[PDB]
Amino acid sequence: QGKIFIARRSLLDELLEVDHIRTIYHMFIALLILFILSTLVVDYIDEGRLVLEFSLLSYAFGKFPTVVWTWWIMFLSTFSVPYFLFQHWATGYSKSSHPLIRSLFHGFLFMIFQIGVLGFGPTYVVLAYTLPPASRFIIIFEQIRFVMKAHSFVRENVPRVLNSAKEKSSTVPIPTVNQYLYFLFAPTLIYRDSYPRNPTVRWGYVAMKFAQVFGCFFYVYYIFERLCAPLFRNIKQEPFSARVLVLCVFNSILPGVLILFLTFFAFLHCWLNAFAEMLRFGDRMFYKDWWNSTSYSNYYRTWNVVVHDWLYYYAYKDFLWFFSKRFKSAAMLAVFAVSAVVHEYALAVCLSFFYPVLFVLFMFFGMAFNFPIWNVLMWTSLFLGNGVLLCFYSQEWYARQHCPLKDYVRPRSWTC
Amino acid sequence: QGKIFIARRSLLDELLEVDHIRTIYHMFIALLILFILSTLVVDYIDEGRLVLEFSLLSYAFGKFPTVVWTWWIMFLSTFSVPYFLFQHWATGYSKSSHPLIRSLFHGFLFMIFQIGVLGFGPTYVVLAYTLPPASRFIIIFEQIRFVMKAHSFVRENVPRVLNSAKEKSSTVPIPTVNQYLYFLFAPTLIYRDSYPRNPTVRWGYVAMKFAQVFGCFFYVYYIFERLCAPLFRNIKQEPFSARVLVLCVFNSILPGVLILFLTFFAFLHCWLNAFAEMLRFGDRMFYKDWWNSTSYSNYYRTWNVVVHDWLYYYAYKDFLWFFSKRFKSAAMLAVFAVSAVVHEYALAVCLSFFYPVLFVLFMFFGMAFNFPIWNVLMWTSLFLGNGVLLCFYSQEWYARQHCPLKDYVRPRSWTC
């Protein structure tokens, strides 16, 4: 019915000790060194001198004070008002006569809080202040994580209070402020927080892995520059040939697959692991081997098991017993769908589109491969889907960048 | 003083059972499936129908009857006349009075045999019949292997006869015809042949790995087509910009590194292993982990340990005690040098050049990195060297293909 946190170490950290995968990692970072050397040489050729401009990151992270102010107000809101609302509701529930009306009132209050304060704020800051595209993504990912963990907090703390008031003890098991402040930075996503912990904080370890994140970000940056610039920077003498389109979906796979592997590694492994060992909770793995995945169910099961666990437990179970319809084969097909749309939302704000190639891509993916060789099929479909989504998104982004076309129903499909 | 053949299995065959490297292999073959699908789609777009032309292999393997006739005469020569010459020399040596003059006579006879019959034949077939470029490579690699194994045969069988005639026994330990015919197809390169053997012949195994070779060859083919065509097919509106050159040496690394990895795998692992288990001698590994290589000595030590063992034993030891000079630090720097030149020769015949970028590349490599982070330096230098050699060779090949310029001292360096 619940989840057990066991203190096993991260999978990739245990696996990276073997010398072969060690050499794969060294090959990756040698490729990065080659990238930076090629970039410095190209800059020294083009400008003659004065290397290391770093222009794309300056354009993508422009209004950074606005972003950090938005994050400050976001964090203080999601830290203060849900806790205070739950305190008031628990007191008014356990104190006096029939609180079912009061319970529905507080439930509406929390619903409007989450919806208003955590959609309107984060979404309308973007649509009002006209942020850079990458600076929208950080705050929208933050709002998604915050609403997920707030819903987790409430859904975990409701039934305990319910059963304790049914037992009718004045000692209401309300959570404290410090453990909530801890969970707000926890790498997990369920309010049953890191009661299993780590003994000490290896500061060399956290420094190494945080610098690893800081390096992987520049690896993403150099990948974007050296591959997404030559393939996409306004080669728009429109042939509309299927040859050019298939060559884009071919040539964008290497940047696509490198970005996917690298961002998996960076974000999950070292980002979370830095905020794990810095927070004394490195006591849970957050991804099994997603390459060892023949069927689709397993692939979703062990890619970013944080999101998978949150979605599975809360969405699957609660949203399932709420319906228990005659067609329960969609028990996953439903949640993935909204997952799709939330990813669509994640690509709706920062891209200023709604072009749902990820949505229909996921639908074709699932409805085609739900009905060892399966591992090869999974890898080839992953390459092709990654490549097509990357080429389509970059192509539409630069085609709308070509002409502003001043409701965005499928724009820039014609080369402007 | 000698070598011991132990029946340990191939390294990569034992390592490929682990599921992670298994997934790397499946990723590779899924990439190949994506390659062939992209090629069929591009052909169906360009021609409208009538897929699967296979033109480049028809041009590269044109005069195949001539190649197989050359190989037949090569094999029958190197199978008959060295054996007969050694028989006659051993008999005339152990039979009668002072054979030092006769021994020098037979030594000159074998020297002229190897030099004439195994340079002139194979090299002058090429320079007379004007073979396709890839069909030169098969016969020149065959002549190199044949001269190496013939020299091995003679250098192993001389001292045994010497010591046996010093002991003065009429039973001269001459080798038989069948074991020589076996060694001529043996995967090893030392005449101390596969006395350790395998019990049986797994025909499913040899069929699978031979089909694996046949697939890896097409993987090389599709790599060449989809990457070396767009980057190199006569984009010759000469800027002579350092930017275009560094972008070539950058963009040719992925085809370069894929070709190197794949050809290592294909040729060594499955080619040799098919001719190992089909010949009842899979009782020796022929490469350790060359990725786990920090220093240069180890890298050369365990890349294609067949050639390394032949060179090391015969060249190193014999050519070393023949000089034992005051500067013996070149004990490796010498042999590698001739190795370089033989590779240069391997790239002198089939490329119709002598452009020695591999030679000076190897020299800079060694003289710069002889004096974990070393693993990264090795990988980045390997990427850069592979890329520069591939771009230079393809560029010069296509630039000489542009205009024939009808002694080839550094041609096509100007864009024709």
Ligand SMILES: CC(C)CCC[C@@H](C)[C@H]1CC[C@H]2[C@@H]3CC=C4C[C@@H](O)CC[C@]4(C)[C@H]3CC[C@]12C
């Ligand atoms: C059918 C054809 C395409 C198969 C091609 C197989 C090639 C791509 C694969 C199969 C097994 C692989 C090797 C297995 C493990 C390692 C250890 C790592 O530290 C470096 C890469 C290296 C050395 C791999 C390189 C590429 C490799 C040799």
Ligand SMILES: CC(C)CCC[C@@H](C)[C@H]1CC[C@H]2[C@@H]3CC=C4C[C@@H](O)CC[C@]4(C)[C@H]3CC[C@]12C
């Ligand atoms: C400093 C930055 C560049 C490091 C980037 C590290 C990335 C490229 C590396 C480090 C460890 C690697 C993983 C280790 C082993 C495997 C198992 C194999 O079956 C699939 C690839 C996979 C999943 C690797 C993918 C790429 C990987 C995650």
Ligand SMILES: CCCCCCCCCCC(C)(C)C(=O)Nc1c(OC)cc(OC)cc1OC
């Ligand atoms: C830009 C080229 C494509 C790169 C792909 C990865 C980009 C960073 C994604 C980061 C994020 C959002 C956390 C994530 O992993 N996404 C994700 C997931 O977790 C919510 C679950 C999931 O189900 C199997 C599939 C998912 O992506 C398909």
Ligand SMILES: CCCCCCCCCCC(C)(C)C(=O)Nc1c(OC)cc(OC)cc1OC
């Ligand atoms: C075309 C792009 C570059 C691809 C590189 C591999 C091509 C096939 C080579 C096949 C062959 C000749 C057998 C070989 O492995 N060469 C080789 C070697 O053995 C003799 C020893 C050696 O010393 C460390 C270095 C060697 O190559 C640098």
